[PDB]
Design a protein around this ligand. Sequence first.
Ligand SMILES: Nc1ncnc2c1ncn2[C@@H]1O[C@H](COP(=O)(O)OP(=O)(O)O)[C@@H](O)[C@H]1O
Ligand SMILES: CCOC(=O)C1=C(C)NC(=S)N[C@H]1c1cccc(O)c1
Ligand SMILES: [Mg+2]
Length: 331
Amino acid sequence: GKNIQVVVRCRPFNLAERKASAHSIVECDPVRKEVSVRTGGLADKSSRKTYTFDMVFGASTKQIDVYRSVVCPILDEVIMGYNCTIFAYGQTGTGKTFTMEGERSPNEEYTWEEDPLAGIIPRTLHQIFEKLTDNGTEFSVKVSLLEIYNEELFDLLNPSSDVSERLQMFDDPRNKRGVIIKGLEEITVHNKDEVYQILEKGAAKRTTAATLMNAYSSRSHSVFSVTIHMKETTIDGEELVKIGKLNLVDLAGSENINQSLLTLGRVITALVERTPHVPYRESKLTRILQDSLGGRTRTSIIATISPASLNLEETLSTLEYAHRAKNILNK
Ligand SMILES: Nc1ncnc2c1ncn2[C@@H]1O[C@H](COP(=O)(O)OP(=O)(O)O)[C@@H](O)[C@H]1O
Ligand SMILES: CCOC(=O)C1=C(C)NC(=S)N[C@H]1c1cccc(O)c1
Ligand SMILES: [Mg+2]
């Protein structure tokens, strides 16, 4: 029906890299949707590997650029009453969290609503209220933040429990491409002015998780879901009741223990090789997101890479992985 769309985003060099006068081994050509990597040698003469994707974003790409080109189109589909998922995949330190969540500009220069460093999640929540409050639509927004570490599930938005309490997952007797996560809390976001504090609470609880679990920020998978219940009444009088859900997934670092990460790779292989048996059941992540992998959910993957020569091997691994994913078909 529809191939999973894959986009690549290369981050810029940081301070420590700039001062060292580092030479980028990555060249991005958005118009041609290609990414080229210097696999050995220098700029005078050398070999390179090139890959074509659905979209390519170089180091000069700002958060708003990513939102306008990839997220906006997807959010519109969600608002039409469909389900969508966006994965962030890549080596630790390449920008998965920066892309999915973003961060705050230093010294309280901007409000969260205007911060140029804000990522996909905050921009999406803000825009949902902007677009639906604008037109004549009755709506409700609910969010949840589920995280997976060592194949255990945690609810990062429940203010009544601590990160030591794991959640139980069961098969949904009703629908077969889904599961039931007992205890997972869904928080109602009444208005745009309740967004930041809800996101902050999740961030604070995540800090306690990092203290209890080793390399939590690198080894955990985060699934932020936003569900929108709408009752739209056209200027003529017809009412259209629809429900849309968007899953924003920040995957564990791909650098080479993580059953969900290993299984995701195996699921993709089975899907692209057209193998009858797809191992969805082998991990919590793939059971939870089964409909996003060869299912009926519109899925996109943002593969993040580094431009530093020090990360050549992992950069190539990420590109090869992302290129293969382009052949997965959903409906
Ligand atoms: N596109 C980008 N533009 C500017 N800085 C970035 C970008 N991507 C990542 N960074 C910076 O690079 C570092 C890597 O961040 P992070 O998002 O945490 O990576 P990851 O989640 O993949 O481990 C951070 O200090 C972040 O601010
Ligand atoms: C305490 C600092 O928090 C953050 O930067 C963010 C949090 C909690 N949660 C998400 S999803 N993204 C970050 C965020 C939220 C709003 C505006 C921004 O520019 C960055
Ligand atoms: Mg991260």
